[PDB]
Structure formats: C-alpha cells, structure tokens
Amino acid sequence: LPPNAPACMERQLEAARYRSDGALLLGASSLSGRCWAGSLWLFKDPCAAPNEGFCSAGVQTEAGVADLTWVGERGILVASDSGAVELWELDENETLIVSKFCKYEHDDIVSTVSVLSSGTQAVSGSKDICIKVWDLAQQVVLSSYRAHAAQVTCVAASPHKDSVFLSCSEDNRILLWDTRCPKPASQIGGYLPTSLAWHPQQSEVFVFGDENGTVSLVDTVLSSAVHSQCVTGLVFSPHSVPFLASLSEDCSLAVLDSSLSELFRSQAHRDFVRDATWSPLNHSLLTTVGWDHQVVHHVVPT
Amino acid sequence: RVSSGRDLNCVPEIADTLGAVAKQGFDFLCMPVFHPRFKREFIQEPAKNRPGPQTRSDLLLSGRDWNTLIVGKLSPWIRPDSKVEKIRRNSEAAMLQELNFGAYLGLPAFLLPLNQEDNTNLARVLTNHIHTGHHSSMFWMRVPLVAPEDLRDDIIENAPTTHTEEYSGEEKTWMWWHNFRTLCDYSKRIAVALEIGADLPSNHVIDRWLGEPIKAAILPTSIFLTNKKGFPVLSKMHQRLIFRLLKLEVQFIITGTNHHSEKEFCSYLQYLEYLSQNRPPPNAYELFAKGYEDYLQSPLQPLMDNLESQTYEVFEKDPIKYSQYQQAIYKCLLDRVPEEEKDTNVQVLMVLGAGRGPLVNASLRAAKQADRRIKLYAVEKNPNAVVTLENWQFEEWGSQVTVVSSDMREWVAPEKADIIVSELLGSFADNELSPECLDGAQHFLKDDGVSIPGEYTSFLAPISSSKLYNEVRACREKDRDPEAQFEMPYVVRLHNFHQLSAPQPCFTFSHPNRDPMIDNNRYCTLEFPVEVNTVLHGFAGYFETVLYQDITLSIRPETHSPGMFSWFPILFPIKQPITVREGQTICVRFWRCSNSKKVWYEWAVTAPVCSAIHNPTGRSYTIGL
Numbered sequence: 001l002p003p004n005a006p007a008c009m010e011r012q013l014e015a016a017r018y019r020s021d022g023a024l025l026l027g028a029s030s031l032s033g034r035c036w037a038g039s040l041w042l043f044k045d046p047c048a049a050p051n052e053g054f055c056s057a058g059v060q061t062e063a064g065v066a067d068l069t070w071v072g073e074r075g076i077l078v079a080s081d082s083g084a085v086e087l088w089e090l091d092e093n094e095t096l097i098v099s100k101f102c103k104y105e106h107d108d109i110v111s112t113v114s115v116l117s118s119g120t121q122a123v124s125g126s127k128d129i130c131i132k133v134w135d136l137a138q139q140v141v142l143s144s145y146r147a148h149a150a151q152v153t154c155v156a157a158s159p160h161k162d163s164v165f166l167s168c169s170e171d172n173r174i175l176l177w178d179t180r181c182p183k184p185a186s187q188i189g190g191y192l193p194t195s196l197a198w199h200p201q202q203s204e205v206f207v208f209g210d211e212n213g214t215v216s217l218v219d220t221v222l223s224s225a226v227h228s229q230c231v232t233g234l235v236f237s238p239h240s241v242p243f244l245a246s247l248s249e250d251c252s253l254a255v256l257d258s259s260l261s262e263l264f265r266s267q268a269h270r271d272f273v274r275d276a277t278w279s280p281l282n283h284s285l286l287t288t289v290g291w292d293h294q295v296v297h298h299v300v301p302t
Numbered sequence: 303r304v305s306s307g308r309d310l311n312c313v314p315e316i317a318d319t320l321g322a323v324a325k326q327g328f329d330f331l332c333m334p335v336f337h338p339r340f341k342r343e344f345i346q347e348p349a350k351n352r353p354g355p356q357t358r359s360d361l362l363l364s365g366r367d368w369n370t371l372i373v374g375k376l377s378p379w380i381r382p383d384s385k386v387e388k389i390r391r392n393s394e395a396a397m398l399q400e401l402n403f404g405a406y407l408g409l410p411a412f413l414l415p416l417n418q419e420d421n422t423n424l425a426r427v428l429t430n431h432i433h434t435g436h437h438s439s440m441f442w443m444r445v446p447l448v449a450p451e452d453l454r455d456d457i458i459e460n461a462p463t464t465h466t467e468e469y470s471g472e473e474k475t476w477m478w479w480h481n482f483r484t485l486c487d488y489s490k491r492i493a494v495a496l497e498i499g500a501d502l503p504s505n506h507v508i509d510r511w512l513g514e515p516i517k518a519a520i521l522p523t524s525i526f527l528t529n530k531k532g533f534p535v536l537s538k539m540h541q542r543l544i545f546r547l548l549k550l551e552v553q554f555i556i557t558g559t560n561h562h563s564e565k566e567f568c569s570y571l572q573y574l575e576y577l578s579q580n581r582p583p584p585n586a587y588e589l590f591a592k593g594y595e596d597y598l599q600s601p602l603q604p605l606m607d608n609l610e611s612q613t614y615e616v617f618e619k620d621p622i623k624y625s626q627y628q629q630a631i632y633k634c635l636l637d638r639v640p641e642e643e644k645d646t647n648v649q650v651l652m653v654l655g656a657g658r659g660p661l662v663n664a665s666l667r668a669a670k671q672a673d674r675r676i677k678l679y680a681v682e683k684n685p686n687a688v689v690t691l692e693n694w695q696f697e698e699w700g701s702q703v704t705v706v707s708s709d710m711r712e713w714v715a716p717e718k719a720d721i722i723v724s725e726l727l728g729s730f731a732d733n734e735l736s737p738e739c740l741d742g743a744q745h746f747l748k749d750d751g752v753s754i755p756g757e758y759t760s761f762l763a764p765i766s767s768s769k770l771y772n773e774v775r776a777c778r779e780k781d782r783d784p785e786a787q788f789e790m791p792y793v794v795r796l797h798n799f800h801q802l803s804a805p806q807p808c809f810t811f812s813h814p815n816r817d818p819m820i821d822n823n824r825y826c827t828l829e830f831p832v833e834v835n836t837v838l839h840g841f842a843g844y845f846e847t848v849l850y851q852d853i854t855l856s857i858r859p860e861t862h863s864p865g866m867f868s869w870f871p872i873l874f875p876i877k878q879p880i881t882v883r884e885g886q887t888i889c890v891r892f893w894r895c896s897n898s899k900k901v902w903y904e905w906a907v908t909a910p911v912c913s914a915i916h917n918p919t920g921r922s923y924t925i926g927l
C-alpha cells in the first residue's frame with residue numbers, strides 16, 4: 001500500500017510492459033460502473049500482481065488508459081480517453097508516480113502511442129483520424145498529420161530508424177512513414193488492419209493482424225489464420241530468432257515462429273486479451289493481461 | 303439566445319461532467335451511454351458471459367435530466383455494415399442494446415454516424431427499433447459536409463488527392479443521407495446533424511442540404527481561428543454559413559477539445575452568442591410569420607364558407623396592403639372625373655366582398671384625398687360580417703354607404719357601377735374563384751367601368767423540401783383515400799425548402815372580361831431549367847395582381863410588395879419524389895378545371911419522369927362555387 005496509490009484497481013487491464021530490470025508496469029481503466037477513470041501501477045514483483053497491496057507504486061488518472069509505453073527507465077507515456085497524451089515520471093525513490101505534463105491536443109480518444117528510436121520523440125494516433133509527432137522534452141506537438149480517413153487503430157515506431165513508423169486505420173490503409181520525405185506517408189498493399197509489429201532483427205520486415213483473425217508477414221506474402229476474432233496486438237520475443245505472440249478478442253493467446261506456425265496456445269483468459277510482454281530476465285516467461293483482471297505468467301516451450 | 307450543446311466522448315463522472323458543462327453555459331450534452339471502448343461479445347464464449355454491470359446506473363441522474371439534458375451517442379466500434387460476418391452480428395445486437403437502453407432512459411435524441419457509403423444494415427436495425435413501440439425520441443444522423451477521405455492531407459506519396467473537380471463526387475455525403483433516409487421510409491424521427499469541416503465545399507454542396515431536416519450543426523473547435531486578443535472566431539465564409547443555419551434555428555454542437563488553452567472553454571460558446579445577436583432583426587413580416595414557418599394550412603374558401611371574426615381581424619392588420627388599394631382608387635377617381643366636374647360627377651363604387659369594411663374605409667379615404675364625390679355600395683354575402691358593416695354604417699358612414707347582404711352573382715343592382723373593388727384573391731390568385739364571382743357581377747358594371755384589381759397572374763416554381771414532403775405525408779386521415787393529402791394544395795409559410803428554378807407565370811385573368819365566349823378553364827405547360835442535382839417534392843405558388851395601372855400587389859419573391867404580411871405561398875405536392883440531375887428540365891402541366899358546381903386544379907410532371915395526374919376530376923380537392 002504505497003502512498004498516493006488507490007486502494008482499488010480498475011477491473012479492465014489494458015497494458016503490461018516489462019522494463020530493463022524486470023519491474024512490471026500495469027495500465028488499467030474502468031470501462032463500466034459509476035466512475036470511468038484509469039490508473040497506473042508498478043510491480044517490482046511480477047508474481048504479486050495484480051494485487052494492489054503488494055505493488056511498488058501507483059496513481060489514479062482523470063480518464064481511462066487506452067494505451068501506454070515506457071519512456072526510458074522512469075518515464076510512462078499514456079494515451080488517454082480524454083484526448084490528451086500524458087507523460088508520468090517516477091521519482092528517484094520509485095515510490096511515487098508524478099504527472100510530468102498533460103496536453104489536450106487530440107479531439108477524440110487517443111487509442112495508440114509509441115516512442116521513437118531516439119527516446120525523445122513519440123507518435124500518437126487517435127479516433128480524430130489525426131497522427132501527431134511529439135517533442136517529449138518541449139511538451140509540444142512537432143507535426144500533425146491527417147493521412148487516414150478513419151480511426152487510427154495502431155502506430156508503431158521503427159525500432160532503429162528515428163523517423164520511420166507504421167500506422168494502420170479502419171480506412172483499410174497501412175501507411176509507412178518517413179518524416180524525411182516531403183510526402184512522409186506511403187501506402188503498403190482486404191480486411192481492416194488492427195495491429196502492427198516491426199521485426200526486431202530485420203529492418204524492412206513487419207507483421208500485421210486483421211479484424212478477421214489473420215496474421216500476415218509483409219516485406220517492403222505469408223499469412224496464417226491464427227485467431228477467430230480481431231487481432232488486438234503482436235509482440236515479438238527478445239530471442240535471437242524471435243517468436244511472435246499474438247493476442248486477440250477471442251480470449252486466446254498464440255505463439256508463432258518464423259513462418260507463422262502455432263507453437264503455443266493459451267486460453268487462461270476469460271475475457272479479451274489486451275497485451276503481452278516478454279520478461280527480460282527469463283526469455284521463456286510471457287506475461288499477458290486482460291479485461292478479466294488476470295495477470296497470467298506463461299512458460300512458453302522453446 | 304442560442305440552443306447549444308457540448309459533444310463529449312469521455313465522461314469520468316456524469317454528475318461532475320454535467321455540472322461543468324452547464325456552468326460553461328451549454329443547454330445539453332452529447333455523451334456515450336456505454337463506454338466507447340467497452341467492446342461487448344454477444345455470441346461466442348467465454349467473452350459473452352462477462353459479468354456486469356454493462357454500463358452506468360440510471361439513478362445517477364433524475365428522470366427530468368435524462369429527458370432534457372443528455373443526448374446518447376452510438377459506440378464507435380459498432381459497425382453493422384462491416385464485411386466481416388462475426389462483426390455484423392455483434393454490431394446488430396449491440397446497436398439494439400444501446401438504442402433500447404437510450405429508450406429506457408427516455409433520452410430526447412440519439413446520435414448515429416454516417417461516415418461511409420453503405421449503411422444498409424445500419425438502416426435496417428434502426429428501422430426495426432423504430433417499429434418497436436411508438437415513441438417520440440429523435441435520431442440525429444451525424445453526417446459531414448465533406449467526407450473525411452475528401453479532406454485528408456495530400457501527404458501520401460503514392461496516393462495523391464484528387465485535384466480535378468468532381469461535381470457529383472463532392473456531393474457524396476448527401477447521397478449517403480438520402481439513401482439512408484429512403485431506406486427508412488422518411489421516418490419523422492430521423493433527422494440530420496450536419497458536421498462542418500475546416501474547409502467548406504462548393505456552394506452547390508451546401509445548397510444540397512437546403513430543405514433537409516437539419517436539427518443540429520456540429521462545429522469542431524479545430525475550425526475556429528484566433529484573432530488578435532487570442533479568442534476563437536470564425537472565417538467570414540463560416541460566419542456566412544452560421545447565419546444561414548440560425549435562420550433554420552438548428553441546435554449547435556461544439557465538439558473537440560480546447561486548443562485555445564489560454565482562454566476558458568465558454569469562449570467558443572460566447573462567439574456563437576456573439577454572432578447570434580448581430581444579425582438583421584425581425585423585419586415586421588418575419589416578425590409576423592414567425593411561428594407559421596412550414597406550417598401547413600387548408601386554403602380558405604371564403605365563397606363556400608363564412609369566415610370567422612378573427613379571420614377578418616387578421617385581414618385588416620396589413621396597412622400596406624390597403625394603402626395600395628386606397629392609392630389605386632385615388633388614381634382611378636382622378637382619371638374618370640376631370641377637375642371641372644368634381645362637384646357634379648358622383649362616382650358609384652361597389653365593394654364586392656366587403657368583409658368588415660376595410661376597403662369601404664379605404665374608398666372613403668381615397669375620395670377625400672382626391673377631392674371627388676362617391677356613392678358607395680358594400681356587398682357581402684357573409685351575414686355575420688354584415689352585422690359589423692351595418693353597425694359601422696349606422697354609427698359612422700351614414701347614408702353615403704349602402705350595405706347589401708347578397709351574393710354578387712345574384713344581386714340585382716339598382717344602378718350600374720363606375721368602379722368595382724374586390725379582395726377575392728388567394729395565394730394562387732384565382733384559387734378562391736375571384737374570376738367566377740367577378741364574372742357574375744360584371745353585368746352591373748358600366749360599359750366604361752373599371753374593376754379593381756384589373757388583372758392577376760399566378761406563378762409556380764419547383765421546390766425541394768424533404769421536410770414539407772414529410773408533413774404532407776403525415777396528413778393521412780381515417781376515412782378517405784390514403785393518398786388524398788398529396789392531391790390538394792396547402793397554404794404555408796415556406797421555410798426549410800430549396801427553390802429549384804425561377805418562378806414562371808401560370809394562370810392570368812382580366813377584369814372586366816369583355817370577351818363574348820368567357821371560359822375560365824385553363825391548361826398550361828411549364829419547363830423549369832434546373833441547374834443542380836436535387837429531389838423534386840412539389841411546386842410553390844405565388845401571385846401578382848394589378849390593382850390599377852402601376853399600383854400592384856405581389857407575393858412573388860422577386861417582386862414581393864415590400865412590407866406586406868398578406869398571403870403566404872401555396873404548395874402543390876406530388877405523391878412521389880422525383881430525382882433531378884443537373885441540367886435537366888422539369889416539365890409540369892397544370893389545369894384549371896370546372897363544372898357548374900366546383901372548380902379545381904389538376905397537375906402532372908412530364909419531365910424528366912412522368913408523375914401520375916394529381917386530383918383528377920377533383921376527387922381529392924374542389925373549390926366550392
């Protein structure tokens with residue numbers, strides 16, 4: 001029970017991300033009931049989650065948490081329902097989670113957010129159809145792009161190219177971005193895309209899932225029917241030859257290999273599976289959270 | 303005084319949000335009844351067995367607050383027209399759930415988006431909901447002026463935006479709405495919430511939404527400019543649209559977050575109240591007709607029927623109309639009685655249809671300012687109005703005025719008249735049988751006599767108004783033809799409508815009619831060049847009349863008598879709307895038919911398509927002789 005931490009955590013868990021030393025970041029929001037807000041949590045003990053009494057820190061937010069991501073080792077970047085993108089930073093003692101800035105720049109729900117290679121800029125997508133490039137140091141919007149014609153479902157920064165990132169939208173467009181070009185967007189040639197994931201070890205390679213349950217492997221084509229519902233997220237494992245964790249609204253998790261073949265399958269969740277994160281310490285342990293308030297620790301056979 | 307609302311997609315607490323909204327000065331709030339991100343499964347396990355509650359409790363607001371303050375928003379993930387079957391099934395069930403919950407709350411209106419071309423299944427689910435219990439709740443279809451695809455930044459390198467004019471493509475959003483409301487059979491509960499983009503389209507796109515049931519105008523904060531002081535304002539082009547929308551009395555909805563964070567959030571709202579106070583105030587006529595806008599009225603038949611007292615009182619409340627009569631009599635007296643005969647020449651004037659004597663007083667005023675002698679007869683067949691005339695005649699007028707309680711067609715005049723004056727004109731000039739009445743009275747007009755009015759002419763113009771077509775459609779009565787309401791004219795202060803062509807003359811009558819072979823039947827063909835894409839719902843009627851020489855009365859818009867309340871336009875509806883493309887000609891035919899008992903109108907459209915003949919044999923509408 002750390003100070004300035006809510007005694008009750010919201011039911012719907014939306015995101016879970018490991019950092020370098022192994023602490024688990026939890027993002028949750030209440031999507032039903034009287035109050036519709038969200039919270040942020042830090043668990044230096046991953047197995048103690050999601051119990052609120054045995055966490056390292058916590059804080060309540062004004063609105064829900066649609067997406068989040070780490071910023072370095074003490075920074076948390078949040079995509080809020082309120083149309084704002086927030087940045088929170090741990091103290092030197094890592095016992096409090098303090099708001100660094102809160103800028104209301106999007107006109108609708110900020111659905112996705114991603115930190116670029118330099119660690120000083122980030123790209124955000126919202127249901128207002130806009131995509132914004134942020135200056136995390138000056139707390140200002142560098143550029144504002146309206147390339148899509150529908151909700152921006154997912155944006156993913158390039159792992160090593162600081163100016164490149166991917167975005168998909170319900171307009172059935174997958175856009176490759178490069179802010180060095182005069183026209184920075186470029187369309188990559190079905191069913192609506194819903195999740196993007198760069199390949200960690202190959203520059204021009206990424207994978208995307210559609211709302212029909214198909215994961216595809218695309219170069220700058222191989223695809224398999226992995227789920228029976230919308231593919232919510234795609235995460236690669238940190239191995240030299242990485243695996244592919246795919247979570248969906250069918251309440252199941254799948255682990256794929258180089259050729260999108262199924263090696264593992266978990267149905268431990270009873271509601272939607274919202275995120276997956278690979279442990280940096282144990283490369284075979286995989287942590288998944290969902291709207292059933294479950295934090296499952298999978299042992300993926302390798 | 304503007305009725306404005308605030309659009310939100312994020313409500314942490316209803317009590318706290320609604321208070322902050324009202325304190326900023328809004329009248330209502332658009333918010334989701336379920337969390338926008340709270341996707342729900344209805345078929346497949348284990349997600350369908352998600353433990354509740356599924357949304358907020360209805361106890362968080364009073365019944366009066368749900369009835370008057372909250373507007374429900376459909377959740378954005380609900381796509382009943384998705385190409386995925388599993389997503390269609392869930393969306394149908396979720397749409398029925400959210401709509402039924404909104405009805406459970408008694409919400410005054412519910413917001414649904416039109417953001418793509420195919421909303422067929424969205425229309426079916428909504429139509430099914432409408433035919434489930436009779437309710438008054440409204441459905442606002444959110445539709446942008448410009449589709450999002452047609453306003454995206456030209457930043458995709460291998461997919462450049464269109465740089466050539468697509469006249470019909472730039473009207474695509476109206477085609478979205480038109481196809482949707484047509485699938486829903488023109489339900490009176492389905493209205494438009496027009497969304498205004500940062501860049502306005504061409505004028506023909508805004509004129510497309512003329513005559514459409516626009517209930518709300520959505521204004522994003524991202525379209526406002528910033529003046530020197532730092533407050534949000536609008537461009538002169540956007541101001542021009544707001545002024546057009548204020549004439550429609552729509553409700554304005556502010557959406558998007560506060561980008562002018564240096565100012566408080568009611569600053570956007572104060573600018574709307576600012577633009578509202580600055581506009582031409584009611585110009586007497588608009589002050590009078592306000593309240594009768596788009597209100598259908600049965601056309602008076604003062605021959606067949608006896609008008610009530612307060613009907614005459616309204617006739618007498620238009621001084622500009624009668625001063626035109628007084629001037630017409632004034633000019634006529636001078637042309638007939640030379641100066642050297644002003645004491646020996648007594649002119650016999652006969653008001654034919656005197657009512658309660660406004661023309662009689664207008665005649666007495668004319669003879670005085672002209673300095674000529676007149677002998678007055680006041681003929682009026684309405685015996686109840688004759689009571690007013692005879693109390694007037696005994697108390698003031700005296701022996702100068704002679705009241706005659708008789709029909710002008712049967713009255714045996716003791717002498718012939720130098721001037722006959724009449725006010726038997728309707729909104730379509732002759733739709734009260736002024737030709738037939740003045741014909742029968744002609745025998746006691748002198749061979750050189752003058753009739754006032756001398757001649758009149760009716761006008762027609764094709765109009766587009768889905769609102770008025772719906773109101774006519776709502777005039778079905780229990781024990782008559784289910785389509786008879788489309789085969790009869792209506793007097794109405796036309797408002798939310800679109801005139802598709804310049805008015806053209808239809809019927810003309812002249813008095814006295816020296817012709818030996820009098821025949822008041824008419825048949826007229828008109829061809830209206832339409833320079834836009836639209837839907838034809840009916841023809842507006844006006845009239846011009848010549849009291850004497852240059853003194854005239856007119857309700858025709860381009861020659862409207864300035865400052866005259868009298869006579870609203872008339873509306874001839876058609877059973878079935880007719881699509882008209884740009885450059886096509888609308889060809890309409892009109893007949894004035896009659897027998898010994900009744901007079902009536904028949905009309906048909908012959909181009910671009912043929913309509914059925916309307917009111918054949920006066921089966922649905924006749925004017926009593």
Ligand SMILES: Cn1ncc(-c2cc([C@H]3CCCO3)c3c(=O)[nH]nc(CN)c3c2)c1-c1sc2ccccc2c1C#N
Pocket residue numbers: 594599600601602604616617620725726727728729734793794867868869870871
């Ligand atoms: C439905 N109907 N049919 C015919 C006439 C009508 C209307 C008027 C005027 C009165 C003020 C607005 O016009 C006149 C008129 O001035 N003179 N003569 C006639 C008939 N020949 C006459 C006939 C009307 C009426 S009832 C009424 C009551 C309140 C508000 C507007 C109207 C109105 C209209 N327009």
Ligand SMILES: CSC[C@H]1O[C@@H](n2cnc3c(N)ncnc32)[C@H](O)[C@@H]1O
Pocket residue numbers: 604605608609617654655656657681682683684687708709710711725726739
């Ligand atoms: C000013 S509205 C027309 C007036 O003329 C009267 N009127 C209409 N037709 C006739 C008629 N044939 N003879 C006499 N008065 C008439 C009506 O009763 C009404 O007062």
